[PDB]
Amino acid sequence: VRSSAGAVRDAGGAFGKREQAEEERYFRARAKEQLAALKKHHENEIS
Amino acid sequence: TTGRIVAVIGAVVDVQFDEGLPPILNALEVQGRETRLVLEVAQHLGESTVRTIAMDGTEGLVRGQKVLDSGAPIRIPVGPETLGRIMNVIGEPIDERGPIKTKQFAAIHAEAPEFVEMSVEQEILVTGIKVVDLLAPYAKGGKIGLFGGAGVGKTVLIMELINNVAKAHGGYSVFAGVGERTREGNDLYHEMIESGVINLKDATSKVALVYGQMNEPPGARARVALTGLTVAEYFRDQEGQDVLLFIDNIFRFTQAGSEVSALLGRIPSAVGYQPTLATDMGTMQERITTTKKGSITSVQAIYVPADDLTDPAPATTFAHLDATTVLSRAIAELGIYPAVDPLDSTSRIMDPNIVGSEHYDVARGVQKILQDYKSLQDIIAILGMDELSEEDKLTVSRARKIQRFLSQPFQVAEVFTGHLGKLVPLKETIKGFQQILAGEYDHLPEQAFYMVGPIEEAVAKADKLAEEH
Amino acid sequence: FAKLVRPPVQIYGIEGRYATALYSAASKQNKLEQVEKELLRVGQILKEPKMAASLLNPYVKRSVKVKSLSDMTAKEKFSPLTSNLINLLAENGRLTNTPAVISAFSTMMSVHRGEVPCTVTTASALDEATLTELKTVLKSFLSKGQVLKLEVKIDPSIMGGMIVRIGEKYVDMSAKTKIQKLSRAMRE
Amino acid sequence: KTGTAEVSSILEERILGADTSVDLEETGRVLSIGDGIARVHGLRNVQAEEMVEFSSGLKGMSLNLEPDNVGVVVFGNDKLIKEGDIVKRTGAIVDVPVGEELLGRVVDALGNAIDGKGPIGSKARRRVGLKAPGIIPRISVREPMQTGIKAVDSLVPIGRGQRELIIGDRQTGKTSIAIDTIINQKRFNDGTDEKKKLYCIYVAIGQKRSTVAQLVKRLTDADAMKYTIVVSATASDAAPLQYLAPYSGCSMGEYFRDNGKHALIIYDDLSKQAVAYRQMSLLLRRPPGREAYPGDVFYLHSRLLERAAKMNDAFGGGSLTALPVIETQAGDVSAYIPTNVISITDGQIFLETELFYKGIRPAINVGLSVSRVGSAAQTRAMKQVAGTMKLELAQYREVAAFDAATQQLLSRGVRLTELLKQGQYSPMAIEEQVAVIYAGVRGYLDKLEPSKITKFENAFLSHVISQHQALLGKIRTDGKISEESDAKLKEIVTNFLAGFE
Amino acid sequence: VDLEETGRVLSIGDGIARVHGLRNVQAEEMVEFSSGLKGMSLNLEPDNVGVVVFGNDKLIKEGDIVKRTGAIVDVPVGEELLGRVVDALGNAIDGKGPIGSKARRRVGLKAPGIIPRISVREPMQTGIKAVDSLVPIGRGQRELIIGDRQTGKTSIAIDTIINQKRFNDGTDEKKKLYCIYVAIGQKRSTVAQLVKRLTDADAMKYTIVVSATASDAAPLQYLAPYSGCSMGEYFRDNGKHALIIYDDLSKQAVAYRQMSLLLRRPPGREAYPGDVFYLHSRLLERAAKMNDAFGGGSLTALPVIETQAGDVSAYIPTNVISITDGQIFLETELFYKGIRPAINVGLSVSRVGSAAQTRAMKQVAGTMKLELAQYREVAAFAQFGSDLDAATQQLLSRGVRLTELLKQGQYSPMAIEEQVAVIYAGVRGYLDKLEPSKITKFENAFLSHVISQHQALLGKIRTDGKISEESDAKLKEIVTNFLAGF
């Protein structure tokens, strides 16, 4: 047996869930910031 | 000739003859049955005995019944009259509208086109699905496979392909359902009738359904594939026209053979499959082909037992397809639908010469970025994502955006998702993925791309999320 | 099922199983001697080159076999038991091993009348006086009713003495065995 | 190549010309009984899968029709059969009684009452081995079968005519799902809407009789026996009985289906019918396959589950729902028989044995539980609430391993999850389910403590069932939640919330 | 009736006739059925004969008459086959007429002994940088190509076949190499597109495509490799050089397994009979390199194996890995991250080694191998990249460039001198000051530039077969001048 790439997600163990949760956290934060920036740009561009 | 049944064991009936002996593959009619029972010969055991597989339940058979050799293999009606009907494995209709009155009969067993009869042209077949068109483009006249576990999207995807292509097709079509739910067969029949593809009143139907659903004894599930294949063979050769042939499932064609094998007196192979798995499948998959005198755009759903692509059955089928779109359960768990696995679906026309330089560069870029993301997830396991460098957080963000953008809402999935089905022409997909890769959308949230058609719709959805924020 | 009368000696395999069937059939009705006669007559009949070659070809309908055998058993006016047995063998397809069947029956008949077989192996022939006294002594081994059925044999492998077999019992007085026993015992 | 019937006891009959005295057409003699399988010589006119009757009252089913003998399987213990016993035909393919007389009887796999309340007075009999409906008789599953379990009715809706599959490890609550479903239909059956009555059948395959007796007591307690049949082929029963019990139950249900009535049938378990079938096949010397299961153990279940159909209105409009129960070993849902059945059904309820300890009961593992029929078989009000609830749970399930917005999301998800828990043998009407789901999903519990929702729900239900039954009746009859009904629910939820603390 | 030169079918079914008679039939002899069907007599038992039918058993009723042809299986040979498409027995299937070959050979002949051979020393140019530098293949070798699905094995084989066109179009006679491509268990349209592809590159005037496709009966797929190997032994035994490509050898094993399990031979592991080693060993041991006393010819072999899930401990993969002189792993993980051909150079080996490399490619690849070996043991850091000393930083900055030099495109093999020039530029260090993404472009440019102007230097490298210090200096000057203006 050998090691592949991205096998932590495949295994589905605790570590895989920890991946998916942490990544979702980070990109939820960034999506909130990007949505705020999009609204603010919209207001700054109506003018 | 006329023999007499001598033994019945499961679906395997041994019949003894005193006149001449019926060659293998012949069809023998059992005398004294309320409904036509046809036994297909499969062996000559010596002493003028033949082993046979019963195409229909062998309940109520008695040792000594009389059996008449029809004299030729299972013959089925063909012609443009079978369009809009539904047929047994043995050709008799099962939609309760009277007999299929044709001039042409065809034997379901026939040799495959010789090597001197094959075509060598390949032209992409736009399907309107982003992932399929981008990473594993289909081809007109080619054989196509949908490898799925259970409940991943094989049937919804093949219904989407029917709706898309069969409706916009100049030629005819055929849907041979081999050993899958009868609920689905009825659903498809009614969907076609209500969508105009089938027409009960007049002769304007473009589909010739054939059904061997999973309540048929194994002798029947192992042959309805050949029956649908015979109808498509006729439309390819005699009509001299393009044809479509959807098969769902093509695993059951192997499973049924495995079911009867042991009783046929054969030592089992690797995983309980019959020793003749490879050839019993080649002799079938070698008739589903384009030739100089026609063209068949066969699509086939393929069960992958327990999501094990190394199983003998899918492993053997992989070599008989010009394009495979491996649906995956892991992607379907993320909610991406269709679940097509971008790093496992391949094709034979994915070349810079056949699809063009830019299409090829974009497809390879998508694959490479997704693979890089797969590698990075391992590090994100331990570090967390705040620790990732700034050239990789970009890679992860872009890869997530591309994963979402590969999803799409189909017109046959409105019942589940509620959204509206979309078709994305090839240019829209290539342009959208070019832009996502280039970085022209780092300012939109990833969820902006989830279940949208062209890229402009992702922009509009991002704007709507921002406004409603 | 019926209570088939057990034959004296038990044989096994298909041969001995047909033979047991026939023996139990004949024993009822007390037709053993005549049944054996018709059996040893079919033994000669089936060796006929035409029949021998016809019955070994598997490409003649088994019904042809049965019809031919019915003809050849009606011509000889065989007892109904033997005709039925031969028809049975033809139906089942075992007539290819008929000589094993009838032979078994012969054995199963010998043990009936007490022909306890024997065998003597020597390095040379035996003078009729010596052979006769040998028979007289061997007769002492048996029981009442039984009668010796001697079978002389010659082999050069054993040098001296001889080897005697009386049904199951077996005594090896060869010089070979004695030489081996002496050599082993003295070496060990 | 020694034939079985080439014994001496037979060749002797043949030799001395005595076979003509006995009947070898409608009668035979047991060559060899052993381990529950008889070989019979004779019966030249016995049909395949026909029933035969031994000379001691025991019955059997002639499975193997070999050239010279017949492999019969005894529906009982072969302690009483002896070499040479006379087996006499019965003339008819094995069939079982059916009717409304069976309702409320603990019948046996073969249709013989084992509750001791007297003979079944049935009139008609059906062959167990009948073909399932075709493409034409059926129609799309449209009506809802109310399970009475919040999670199932909300996120895994089950229609009438649909074959679900309750799959999970041992001791995770599959029979509990089945019995909640059986008990729930009590409200519909005790009513006048004859088109909503559902008649239940429980097939107990390879379960100790104590279990079946406790289950029957539980059903009688809720007086859910006047409309229930129980086909009981328990562990002590010969393998052929355990192999035939599902087909007896399925035919008893095909009766109600073919007469415009709606039936539900629950096989428990099918993984033990498969074991009984394997034993039968191996004792008939049929070659094994995977794990020794006969080569055709898929067809065995496919031909059984394909009979759960939903007939069109030209065929009476009847219906037969099936709820097979499979038992995986260690969550290894990728085994042989679980995989065989997972692709035969349309939907599956995944009982996970670690959701079961972490607190979630019933253990339904949403996200892995699917219903291919889907929202098409749901009530409009439940559609409305479930549309939001399923989505919110889907989002919360990817941020469970832990901001303000996402913190609110997790809070709401935990609120919903505590709302999906349930008692046992206490199903709820659809109106109450939608009421509490609405209360929890609009946000009227975003502040209440988690450990209190478990009680709040309970209390809340009582309040409505004691104060605003008119609203529930309106929601139920109207089917959908009307705007005035929505406002009434809003008022009621806020009022109870304020006065609950 | 004759039951020595003739017999009659007792039974048939699943392609295994059981014949009665044929008392004088030899084992592995070709009998003929009354229906114009041939067959091979494999099981000689006391009572019958087990004939495997070369075709469909629909035409073989019970009671048929079978007549022995008196000869072991044999196939045509010669240069009359070149450019044709024959089936597992020499019958043409390209519809260009009769093959017209005078000679014949037995498929089951034995390999050359211990003395006839001589150590593999010539280089068999595959035209692929990765193969030709890091896992070289000599003439007379047996280099397994083992991989997963759709990783690029058939493409390695076809690039090898296409490359030989430069040698076969020249006048040097001991560099000419004739290719044979045995295609076992492949959809016919695949073979048709392959023949078209070979015609496009004009590489079909010295190629013999032996076709045993999926529809063909099991015996034809079991027999195709031996037919091809005999047509190749013909060129070996006449002072010519051959290259036979079995594709795959796993499907020959599957066909053989079907034959055995239907003849009822003891199964064994994975149901493979006990001869799936003997089967392949007595095939791959016919790739030799005869010494001058025997002509000097040679016969390379490139068996292709598919491994399920990269499992190379399965039965057949290990059987064929313990028989061959190397292996070229083709991992898909590398395939999708840009590395195409996806030749995993850690697992790939060649027990022949650099004994079969031209002196120039030895001179360069000797150090390239070490550079990549050093890179492969600090590859993990690549992500972190910073935070590490200049030592590992330079290691994995050289490794990335070297890796990106080994990328190559469909059907475009490179002449040995051009590979040497590119690897020289890359490894001597004239690229470490370049952004990795541009490396490929540089290559695709530099190559062309060198091809246009400095053809004389390439000719000198090709002929001398070595990088003389004069040529070394001239090449350094060329690289420096070009890299300056980029």
Ligand SMILES: Nc1ncnc2c1ncn2[C@@H]1O[C@H](COP(=O)(O)OP(=O)(O)OP(=O)(O)O)[C@@H](O)[C@H]1O
């Ligand atoms: N919703 C629930 N709440 C609390 N307990 C439950 C619930 N459902 C099931 N249980 C508990 O699970 C136990 C066994 O469950 P059940 O017998 O229904 O599962 P099962 O898998 O059918 O068991 P087996 O497979 O052994 O027959 C019961 O004693 C019951 O207390």
Ligand SMILES: Nc1ncnc2c1ncn2[C@@H]1O[C@H](COP(=O)(O)OP(=O)(O)OP(=O)(O)O)[C@@H](O)[C@H]1O
């Ligand atoms: N050197 C390469 N550069 C770019 N693409 C390649 C290269 N080699 C192979 N490919 C691509 O990989 C795909 C599969 O190639 P190939 O047919 O050689 O693999 P295979 O192992 O033969 O497939 P199968 O196992 O199905 O026969 C092809 O579409 C081809 O475009």
Ligand SMILES: Nc1ncnc2c1ncn2[C@@H]1O[C@H](COP(=O)(O)OP(=O)(O)O)[C@@H](O)[C@H]1O
């Ligand atoms: N495109 C899609 N959009 C939303 N849901 C889907 C989609 N495809 C499949 N699904 C869900 O996955 C399930 C898979 O069922 P289906 O694909 O019909 O059968 P199969 O097991 O043959 O794949 C469907 O019932 C559906 O709920």
Ligand SMILES: [Mg+2]
């Ligand atoms: Mg499906």
Ligand SMILES: [Mg+2]
């Ligand atoms: Mg239980």
Ligand SMILES: [Mg+2]
């Ligand atoms: Mg290939």
